Amino acid sequence: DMYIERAGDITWEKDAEVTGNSPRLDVALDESGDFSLVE
């Protein structure tokens, strides 16, 4: 049996670690909610 535990508040943090790119990917979504890379 699964259970939940509090992890914190939902607030925006000013001066947080800015990382990661912004790619434009061509994807397909199947009936099972799974994404796939279209080419």
Partner: protein
């Protein structure tokens, strides 16, 4: 049990020790998470029980105690903050500019940040603190990395 608004870890004792299978958002007495985290199963909150209300395998979303409450959306221009709650590690806001998933049914936001599968259900936030979607459903790019979509449900 605890219905206080905030971000929560989804855990299980069915394996060795205590294993984090995902994350979720408590908002307006409703627990929101990704379907692949719980598989529609009931959750426990102390002595209390959370029974599922709504769910969909294609959207990969599931709500507990009531209907989906989150309705904010990425504006297509601003940087967002993934409130990453990783397994065993402390909650941590990571700022990023999202990419785009182009599909036959329209474009969706996408955060290009790699995290373990146990991070699934971690909220993605706007500068207002609103939950614009959940992290955990995306694709594996050429460099093995994960680029998850910004998965938001529908508020009736």
């Amino acid at each position: 049990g605890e219905t206080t608004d905030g971000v929560y870890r989804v855990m299980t004792r069915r394996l060795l020790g205590s294993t984090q299978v995902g994350v979720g958002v408590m908002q307006e007495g409703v627990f929101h998470t990704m379907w692949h985290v719980t598989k529609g199963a009931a959750l426990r909150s102390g002595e209390g029980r959370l029974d599922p209300y709504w769910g969909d395998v294609k959207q990969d979303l599931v709500s507990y105690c009531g209907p989906w409450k989150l309705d904010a959306a990425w504006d297509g221009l601003s940087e967002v903050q993934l409130l990453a709650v990783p397994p065993g590690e402390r909650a941590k806001n990571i700022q990023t500019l999202p990419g785009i998933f182009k599909t036959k049914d329209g474009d969706i936001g996408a955060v290009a940040l790699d995290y373990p599968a146990g991070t699934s259900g971690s909220p993605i936030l706007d500068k207002c603190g609103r939950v614009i979607g959940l992290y955990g459903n995306g694709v594996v790019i050429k460099n093995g990395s994960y680029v998850s979509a910004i998965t938001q449900g529908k508020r009736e």
